[PDB]
Amino acid sequence: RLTYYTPDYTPKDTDILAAFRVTPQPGVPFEEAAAAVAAESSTGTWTTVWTDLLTDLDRYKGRCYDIEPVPGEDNQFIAYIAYPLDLFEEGSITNVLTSIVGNVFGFKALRALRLEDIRFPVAYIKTFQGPPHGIQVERDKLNKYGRPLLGCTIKPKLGLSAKNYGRAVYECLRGGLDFTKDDENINSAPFQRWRDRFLFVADAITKAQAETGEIKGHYLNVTAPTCEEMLKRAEYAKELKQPIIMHDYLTAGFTANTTLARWCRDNGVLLHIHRAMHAVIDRQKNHGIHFRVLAKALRLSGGDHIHTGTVVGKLEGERGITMGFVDLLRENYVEQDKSRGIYFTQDWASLPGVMAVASGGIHVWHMPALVEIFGDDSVLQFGGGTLGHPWGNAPGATANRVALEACVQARNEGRNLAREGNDVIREAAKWSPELAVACELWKEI
Amino acid sequence: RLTYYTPDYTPKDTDILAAFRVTPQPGVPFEEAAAAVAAESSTGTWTTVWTDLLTDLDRYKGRCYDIEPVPGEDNQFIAYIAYPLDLFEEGSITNVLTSIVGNVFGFKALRALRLEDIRFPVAYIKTFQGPPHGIQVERDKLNKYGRPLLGCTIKPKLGLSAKNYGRAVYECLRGGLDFTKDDENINSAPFQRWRDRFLFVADAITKAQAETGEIKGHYLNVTAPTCEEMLKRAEYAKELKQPIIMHDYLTAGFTANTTLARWCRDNGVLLHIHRAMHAVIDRQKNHGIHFRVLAKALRLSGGDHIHTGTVVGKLEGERGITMGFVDLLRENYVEQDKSRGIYFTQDWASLPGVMAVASGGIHVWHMPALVEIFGDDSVLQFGGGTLGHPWGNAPGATANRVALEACVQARNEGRNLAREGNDVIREAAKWSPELAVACELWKEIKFEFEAM
Amino acid sequence: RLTYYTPDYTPKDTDILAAFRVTPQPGVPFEEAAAAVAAESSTGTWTTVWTDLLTDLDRYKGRCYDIEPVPGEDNQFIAYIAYPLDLFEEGSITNVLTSIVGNVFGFKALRALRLEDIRFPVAYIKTFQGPPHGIQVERDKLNKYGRPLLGCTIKPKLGLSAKNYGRAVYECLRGGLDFTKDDENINSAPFQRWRDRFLFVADAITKAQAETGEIKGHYLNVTAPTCEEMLKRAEYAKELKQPIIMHDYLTAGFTANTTLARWCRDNGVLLHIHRAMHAVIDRQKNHGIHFRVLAKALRLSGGDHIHTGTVVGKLEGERGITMGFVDLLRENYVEQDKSRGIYFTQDWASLPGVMAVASGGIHVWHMPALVEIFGDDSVLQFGGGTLGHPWGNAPGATANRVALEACVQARNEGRNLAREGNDVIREAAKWSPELAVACELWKEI
Amino acid sequence: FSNHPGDAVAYQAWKLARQYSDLQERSRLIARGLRFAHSETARKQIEQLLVDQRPAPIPPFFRFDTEDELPRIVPVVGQLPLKAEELKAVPLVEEIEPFRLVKFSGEQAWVALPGWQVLLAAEDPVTILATSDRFPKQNQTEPGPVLVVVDRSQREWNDFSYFVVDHDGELDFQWFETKPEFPILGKVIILVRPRKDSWQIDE
Amino acid sequence: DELPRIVPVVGQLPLKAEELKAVPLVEEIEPFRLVKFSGEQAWVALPGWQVLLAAEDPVTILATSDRFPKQNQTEPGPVLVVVDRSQREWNDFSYFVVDHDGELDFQWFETKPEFPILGKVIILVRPRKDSWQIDE
Amino acid sequence: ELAQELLRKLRQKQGNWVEWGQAIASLQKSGYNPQDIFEATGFEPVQQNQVIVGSQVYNSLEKSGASAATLAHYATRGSDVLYELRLLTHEERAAAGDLTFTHKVDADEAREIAKAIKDFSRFRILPEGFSNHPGDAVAYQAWKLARQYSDLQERSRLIARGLRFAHSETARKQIEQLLVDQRPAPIPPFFRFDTE
């Protein structure tokens, strides 16, 4: 009711700020739409009651302080809303979401609505643990420095016995990769049960780490129907003295994931986050929540890895948007840059950073690009698209470690991966026959 | 890769079936697009390897068995996909979502994608507790039969002291309503801390119940950052002999809700579910997940109440859709009706029904329609739009209770609430001064019938 | 070594700031002394090692950013030091003290040194629970609004049986006071054991609260040799469904008190804080820590009451210093005011406030002054000096409730307590014979 | 801006300073640009940012959208009843790239329809304005106006669709069980009939 | 969703002042928003961008992007330009069509009645496959 | 005794809040406790205290010469604001009320003003160039606090306040002096007679 549009107002260092992309109905003035979004996120439609005469509670009103139309676009604007610190429960992403994205998406007066970014103030951030361990601490724990880490996707996705899964894991670890992945779908099921898979994967890890002299790990999927069961599975991994587990934070949810993250710091286990069912919420440019927010939320409700997708098959425009939230995940201070889709300067208050996980149909030939774009603080997940290596998993692994070591060596010398990227691999393939069969199987780019 | 489109295959009584609304990119044939969702939701887009000797894993192949173009639409179809029973973890909505809606919504080859319905088979349903208590079981726990239950929204939404909230709750219950809601956003906060709120709300329910001689209850919000904390608050509610609690299931998440629902059966506390952040997923007709599915999901990961919004300022297309999922929440068997948006016949295998909760801009004049549309099995939540009662909350309660008794009484005689609905409340206002002030505070409405 | 004096530096909103009153030795330049205080509080004397060539850790240096000589005084200055947020453990006053007041008081190069104030930044404050309950919440719990609360000191201090203590408590509660006090010395002892006193005090409370229709409480002293025992005693009070307990936070210490404060919020029991052995640390104007800091520390490591002493026998200068830290305990924003001894603006970030407890040789005649100076949010502790009431404890209580109700009534009408203060009581004494015997026993002022 | 590192840093600071529309918020970034700029061409670009004499307003650009399809302009032969002759007379439309213009000299009526895949697929489309009772009654709804689009280049028979036919010098829509000798002038591809206190949340 | 709109096209710039003024106002015939016309004309169907739908009298002109200020690095290309003839009040934040001694051009002056505002520029628009891989 | 009229009117929200304050105080003095009053009427004991003391403050506004704009406004809002002025005397309240009403002061800001006025009233011999008008008292606070800051940017909040609040022209100068940063009279090196 236009008490919620106050453009004079300067937002405080303690306020939570939201940037919604508002697409109002034809004939709806922007000033009203904006004031509706602040009133429905913060306080509600205000219900005047006899109590208002005695004492006023207006300090807890959220409010639109700026209204900026989107150029290039159809009757569209960015509502910049500011909520005070006292609205929110300390350490609860669950509440943040409940208040900010709770009801406001269900108007009729808007055609559509999308939350693009949240400014988490330092004094709110300091109430979260954040990642169980940082980028830094993870490298310390694993003794892996100066390069991206390499992970493996087991195939086929589903239907394998626990012992088979574990044998498939052994090879791909034995052949030079650092991690292996439990497929997101894989929680306990009739074809394969969660304890048998944990035991045999731990067998595999032990043997593969013994034979190779490198710390190995597998992202054991503790995702589960209940908190009881999630933690039961966490605890068995901890009992098998495992380095890392995983959790589908969106499907399981934020209350559940925040529990697990803190458990992860308490027991010193790494937490690999999968983002299943993100595309339901973050694809449509007119309506939803940009992954950018979901990535910030996962940084606060803890994670040590997060799937960020890939930027190999995507154009220059999306590339910059992808590498914006990757910076929000990994860096301590991220400057406001609206060309990259970052609507506020995010200062993280020395909260640890999450490693970005790249995945898709990537294979040896993509290596130079991935090392170039992302950098060292990342995880590269192979075996994701229609791609096999005809000799096995361990030869397939060798091909990608040799390839990654080659590009990382090359980059450190001063070689240009942007232009010599393909040359570096063919040179590497001359001495490594595992990379030679790989190079011939996929066309370079 | 077109081994996932098999229209000659008849689906099994044990299969989980999905109804995706596929909107392929122009140029992309329906057959490929149908078989993309089958492969990218069920098993991997097959990655052929040297192990084709060991690996005849065709059994775990989800598949499209019918392809049905949506009439009245721009190059759009329903993919009916069938997944076998063994894919899913028992009693796990979290897995059901991870498997079905996990990655398939992030294609490029589709413009958009919306999951309209899921057929949960009987054999899979038997692996879920479902609601902590039925509709019937709830009405027996409370001694409340033959009518809708009445709830109250505390205002203002945010900022009240714990003690204030409790004084507010005391009245609204004292004045004749059954329940009082704790706001969804109200979890522990610097202006109001949870243990204080819970304590004073309990002081109120005790008193109001004693004075009235009706079982009163408040939806205490155990929604919280961690399972540790959520259960801590459930336990304090339980320690205060509380009849009912509430929980923001989508925001908190299914893992955390299923825990709470089971805890709720173990301690015999009623569970009031709030659907905050539904409109993010369930609004755009081309992309997301229909609330229908999120309603079915909440019936499996448990709940006793669920908000269904309102059906009063919405047209007869959308009414049929809203009363299709209110049928899915409350009934045992729900026949396939595609006009209503029910894509599959759903047999619930005696799983308890959830009470539908109506909330919106509703006030005393909406009563006749609400009683007519929903029926007895529902909770009517007042105080929600731009509406106050200028005497206080208890007066505002009395108005609604007197109003509801009037209509329920009237319908039971044989009176038509469709036409005489407004007369029934007018008649009621003659003797009740609280309803009189209310009736004159809001404009009434009469009858603007339907056609189909 | 003068890398720690950087007066150009502007302190950040996230920094912890300290104000030391430095009294250096003759011949010691102020610039060095200041830089020594920052180097010994923050980092230490810096030990150069071969590691310094590779990576530099200078961001964690504390530093003097301002140096202001004290006028009126002998070779004296205020060193304003700024430490970054990352130095400190979240929620630990124990650490704050360990870092800031840990070693720096033990120089030879300084004659003396005193910590006058700490600026706790909002983003550090939000990591503390603070008081278990606020001023506001406490009034809600007790149903006592619009006036100071009244407490009683049992006499004699020591030597009474548990049952005697409880009978003495019954009367003083029965006669109109809100609280009674366990003497600070009283933890379990041969003459009286902690469970017997808790049981009989709870008997007394019940009966006195039944007969009078007012919520009563007693500050049961859970102070104890161990954390185990402290909590054991907390738990029995909780089992006796008691409203309030007490704790000598300085003698027991901050690790112990922070445990108890959080236990107090968890179980909804009020926490009355005694400040025994403050005068050891906060009396001497040249050396120590000003109570101002200790009061801030108690606001963070939780408390619901705190003894602030009295301002009846103390001159205009100390009065303003006393009422500065009382404002730091009770208000949300306190403006920098150096005439009152407040060296930084303290913004509390909606942390609940502590009620100030006034005590000393106060009696009925002091009431007008106490109500005037402190206000409603306070607790008035009678029976502290060489003062008895010859009829009993319950008549003595009646005298002070009647007196307080009279002054509070008077103040609300618009009467001036500053000038009619004495008149208000004599008027009240005409109808209350308990106040009449009291008025005649102590000379007015 | 040159490829000197100092220029590259000044360019970053430049690009980032342009999104801020208030001069106080632009101070950190200008101060950096000046500290770092190596060429004099760059240092000017930075210096420009100090003014707040009004600039060249950014013109109202909208984007060629390849995300959604574009509309098609369709010719309208008039309201039924009509002669075979009047539908034969409307020429094939040539859309002039790059903006899909349509130029025409005689008398004509036009409509802009949405870009529906069927309509884009049509080689030669034409509009006819009729009533809904020209086709079978579908549901209970009363006969209303309908806009009918036909493809004249689709004249091959089938039993599942409707066609425009030359009914002895008259236009008519009918369907066929058995393939006819009656002239078919086109195939019906689209039928279309003609085309608020709610700030209330759907809770 | 939105209604697409048919808009008249006066020809390719360069053009004369009368040519634009010779184009009649379009009457959209309900219920299907038809447009009947007798003389020689050119047309385009655009989307129903809310600003266009708002325009009481719109007209299209085909010009190049270098007729306006250079926005980003991209080379001068073709642009379709829409103007509302019923918006002829001056302001400093938009472009107009003016009276350039026997024809018009597009200009950004803030105080100009001397040259007539024929119309206001509302729209500028430039002219208008192997992956099932998933965003994981 | 029909005293149910008070309750009925209180329950039905007849009249303004000052009426309510007086009604409740009449009921209170007539043998009702605050829980009784809450059961019968919607007013919490905390709200009962707010309006009883608020109405007492309102009595002091009209009995000590508040403007008719102030008494008209505080008739139907601002009980919270008037509760913060309870600390001030019968006489002090009327001017304070005017000031709070003029400046559109919320309860938090009212508390701050009441402190500044109460601070000032303890001075026997008034600070030079400041009257005992509440506006002066607030400007004096802002003055005193601005003098400890030695850099002009840190002095901006406090000057802006002093100007907003200063009532006499003698005070407004004192505030205006603070704007310079021509060097002043250096504070001479005073040491203290030490009785310590």
In total, chain A counts a number of residues equal to: 445
In total, chain B counts a number of residues equal to: 452
Q: Are residues A426 and A325 in the same domain?
A: yes
Residue C125: closest C-alpha in chain A: A123
Domain CATH for B397: 3.20.20.110
Peptide bond into D81 cis (omega under 30): yes
E strand or H helix that includes residue B324: helix B316-330
Q: Is C349 near chain A, with CB under 8 Å?
A: yes
Distance (Å, whole) CA A419 – CA A403: 16
Please tell me what DSSP assigns to residue A105: G
Domain CATH for A67: 3.30.70.150
Q: Are residues B290 and B275 in the same domain?
A: yes
The catalytically annotated residue of A216, A247, A274, A278 is: A274
Task: Let me know: does A45 contact A2? Beta carbons within 8 Å.
Answer: no
Q: Are residues C134 and C40 in the same domain?
A: no
List chain A residues with CB under 8 Å of B387: 47
> Sign of the C-alpha dihedral, residues C166, C172, C173, C179?
negative
E strand or H helix that includes residue C66: strand C63-69
Distance (Å, whole) CA E132 – CA B341: 29
Whether C61 is catalytic:
no
Amino acid at C113: L
Of the candidates C327, C318, C370, C372, the one whose C-alpha atom is nearest the C-alpha of residue C347 is C327
Task: Let me know: does B368 contact B428? Beta carbons within 8 Å.
Answer: no
> Sign of the C-alpha dihedral, residues F56, F57, F58, F59?
positive
Amino acid at F77: R
Q: How far is CA F23 from CA F11, F29, F38, F74, in A?
A: 11, 10, 13, 17
Q: C: neighbours with 3+ CB pairs under 8 Å?
A: A, B, F
- Could you tell me which residues come within 8 angstroms of residue B185 by beta carbon, excluding any fewer than 6 positions away? A87, A95, A98, A99, A102, B157, B158
> Sign of the C-alpha dihedral, residues B338, B341, B342, B344?
positive
Going by DSSP bridges, is the β-strand pair C333-334/C355-359 parallel, antiparallel, or unpaired?
unpaired
Distance (Å, whole) CA B303 – CA C266: 28
Q: Which of residues 95-124 of D touch E (CB under 8 A)?
A: 97-105, 107-114
Amino acid at B296: K
Q: Are residues B120 and B134 in the same domain?
A: no
- Six-digit token pair at B144? 């409340």
Distance (Å, whole) CA A100 – CA A40: 8
Three-class HEC string of D134-155: HCCCCCCCCCCEEEEEEECCCC
E strand or H helix that includes residue B244: strand B244-248
Count B/F contacts: CB-CB distance under 8 Å. Answer: 19
Q: Is D64 near chain A, with CB under 8 Å?
A: no
Q: Is D99 near chain A, with CB under 8 Å?
A: no
List chain B residues with CB under 8 Å of E129: 27
Report CB contact under 8 Å: A109, D199: yes
Within 10 angstroms of residue C79's Cβ, the number of other Cβ atoms is: 27
Peptide bond into E31 cis (omega under 30): yes
Q: Which residues of B are annotated as a binding site for Mg(2+)?
A: 181, 183-184
Q: Is C50 near chain F, with CB under 8 Å?
A: no
Tell me the resolution in Å: 3.0
Going by DSSP bridges, is the β-strand pair D184-192/D145-151 parallel, antiparallel, or unpaired?
antiparallel
Q: What angle do CA D32, D35, D37 make, to 5 degrees?
A: 95
Domain end position, chosen among A70, A93, A128: A128
Q: Which residues pair with B358 in a beta bridge?
A: B309, B380
List chain D residues with CB under 8 Å of A71: 58, 60-61
Q: Are residues A173 and A135 in the same domain?
A: yes
Q: Are residues A162 and A27 in the same domain?
A: no
SS3 at position A439: helix
Task: Let me know: does E5 contact D112? Beta carbons within 8 Å.
Answer: yes
**Interface test with chain E among B25, B46, B108, B284, by most E beta carbons within 10 Å:** B108
Of B162, B190, B191, the CB nearest to C140: B162
Task: Let me know: does C11 contact C45? Beta carbons within 8 Å.
Answer: no
Of the candidates B218, F89, C358, A96, the one whose C-alpha atom is nearest the C-alpha of residue F97 is F89
Check contact B-D (3+ Cβ pairs < 8 Å).
Answer: yes
Please tell me what DSSP assigns to residue B72: T
Q: How far is CA A375 from CA A368, B366, C319, in A?
A: 10, 61, 62
Q: What angle do CA C140, C141, C145 make, to 5 degrees?
A: 40
CA distance E135 to chain A (A): 5
Q: Are residues C56 and C101 in the same domain?
A: yes
Q: Are residues B115 and B143 in the same domain?
A: no
List chain A residues with CB under 8 Å of E49: 74-75
Three-class HEC string of chain D: CCCCHHHHHHHHHHHHHCCCCCCCCCHHHHHHHHHHCCCHHHHHHHHHCCCCCCCCCCCCEECCCCCCCCCEEEEEEEECCCCHHHHHHCCCCCCECCCCEEEECCCEEEEEECCCHHHHHCCCEEEEEEEHHHCCCCCCCCCCEEEEEEECCCCCCCCCCEEEEECCCCEEEEECCCCCCCCEEEEEEEEECCCCCCCCCCC
- Six-digit token pair at D174? 């009918």
Of the candidates C262, C258, C232, C244, the one whose C-alpha atom is nearest the C-alpha of residue C182 is C244
Q: Are residues B123 and B134 in the same domain?
A: no
- Could you tell me which residues come within 8 angstroms of residue A113 by beta carbon, excluding any fewer than 6 positions away? A20, A21, A22, A23, A37, A104, A105, A107, A287
Question: Phi and psi (nearest 5°) for C131?
Answer: -50, 140
Q: How far is CA B286 from CA B31, B113, B138, D191, in A?
A: 19, 6, 37, 22
Report CB contact under 8 Å: D200, B307: no
- Could you tell me which residues come within 8 angstroms of residue A277 by beta carbon, excluding any fewer than 6 positions away? A248, A250, A251, B97, B98, B101, B102, B105
Residue A38, Cα to own-chain centre: how many angstroms? Answer: 28
E strand or H helix that includes residue C78: strand C77-83
Three-class HEC string of chain E: CCCCEEEEEEEECCCEHHHHHCCCCCCCECCCCEEEECCCEEEEEECCCHHHHHCCCEEEEEEEHHHCCCCCCCCCCEEEEEEECCCCCCCCCCCEECCECCECCEECCCCCCCCCCCEEEEEEECCCCCCCCCCC
CA distance D202 to chain B (A): 5
- Let me know how many helices (H) and strands (E) chain A has, helices first: 16, 15
> Sign of the C-alpha dihedral, residues A126, A129, A135, A137?
positive
Report CB contact under 8 Å: E44, D145: no
Q: Is F86 near chain C, with CB under 8 Å?
A: yes
Whether A241 is catalytic:
no
Question: Phi and psi (nearest 5°) for D178?
Answer: -125, 135
DSSP string across C154-176: -SSSS---HHHHHHHHHHHHHTT
Distance (Å, whole) CA B238 – CA B267: 7
Check contact A-B (3+ Cβ pairs < 8 Å).
Answer: yes
Of the candidates A46, A62, A37, the one whose C-alpha atom is nearest the C-alpha of residue A114 is A37
Of the candidates C323, C239, C313, C222, the one whose C-alpha atom is nearest the C-alpha of residue C273 is C222
Buried b (16+ CB within 10 A) or exposed e, B378-413: bbbbbbbbebbbebbbbbbbbbbbbbbbbbbebbee
Report CB contact under 8 Å: A350, C90: no
Task: Let me know: does E111 contact B17? Beta carbons within 8 Å.
Answer: no
CA distance D167 to chain B (A): 29
CA distance A167 to chain B (A): 13
Strands (E), A268-349: 270-274, 288-289, 305-307, 333-334, 346-347
Please tell me what DSSP assigns to residue C252: H
Going by DSSP bridges, is the β-strand pair C179-181/C333-334 parallel, antiparallel, or unpaired?
unpaired
Residue showing tokens 């009233």: F121
Distance (Å, whole) CA C186 – CA C248: 10
Q: B: neighbours with 3+ CB pairs under 8 Å?
A: A, C, D, E, F
Q: Is D139 near chain B, with CB under 8 Å?
A: yes
- Six-digit token pair at B115? 């999951």
Distance (Å, whole) CA C140 – CA C146: 12
Alpha-carbon dihedral B234, B236, B239, B242, rounded to 10 degrees: -60
Task: Let me know: does A219 contact A182? Beta carbons within 8 Å.
Answer: yes
Count B/D contacts: CB-CB distance under 8 Å. Answer: 33
Q: Is A71 near chain D, with CB under 8 Å?
A: yes
Q: How far is CA C20 from CA C15, C17, C321, C337, C340, in A?
A: 16, 10, 16, 16, 16
Q: Are residues A152 and A300 in the same domain?
A: yes
Structure obtained using? X-ray
Q: Are residues B180 and B50 in the same domain?
A: no
Check contact D-E (3+ Cβ pairs < 8 Å).
Answer: yes
Q: Are residues B289 and B183 in the same domain?
A: yes
CA distance A192 to chain C (A): 43
Residue E134: closest C-alpha in chain B: B107
Within 10 angstroms of residue B51's Cβ, the number of other Cβ atoms is: 15
Distance (Å, whole) CA A100 – CA A104: 8
Peptide bond into C156 cis (omega under 30): yes
Residue showing tokens 């995300």: D67
CA distance A283 to chain E (A): 10
Distance (Å, whole) CA A181 – CA F119: 69
Residue D25: closest C-alpha in chain A: A336
Q: Is C136 near chain B, with CB under 8 Å?
A: yes
- Could you tell me which residues come within 8 angstroms of residue D168 by beta carbon, excluding any fewer than 6 positions away? none
Distance (Å, whole) CA A440 – CA A390: 12
Distance (Å, whole) CA B306 – CA B271: 9
Of the candidates C375, C363, C358, C346, the one whose C-alpha atom is nearest the C-alpha of residue C399 is C363
Q: Is C185 near chain B, with CB under 8 Å?
A: no
Total number of domains in chain A: 2
DSSP string across A413-434: HT--HHHHHHHHHHHHHHH-HH
First-residue to last-residue Cα distance in chain D = 54
- Six-digit token pair at C163? 């049952």
Domain end position, chosen among C128, C152, C172: C128
Report CB contact under 8 Å: B391, F38: no
For chain A, how big is the Rg over CA atoms in Å?
24
Q: How far is CA E76 from CA B448, E64, E124, E126, E127, in A?
A: 59, 6, 13, 10, 12
Domain with A105 in it: 1-128
The verdict on whether residue A103 carries a ligand-binding annotation is yes
Distance (Å, whole) CA A3 – CA C173: 50
E strand or H helix that includes residue B220: strand B217-221
Domain end position, chosen among A78, A101, A128: A128
For chain E, how big is the Rg over CA atoms in Å?
17
The verdict on whether residue C98 carries a ligand-binding annotation is no
Report CB contact under 8 Å: E136, B45: no
Task: Let me know: does C79 contact C37? Beta carbons within 8 Å.
Answer: yes
- Six-digit token pair at C311? 């301002």
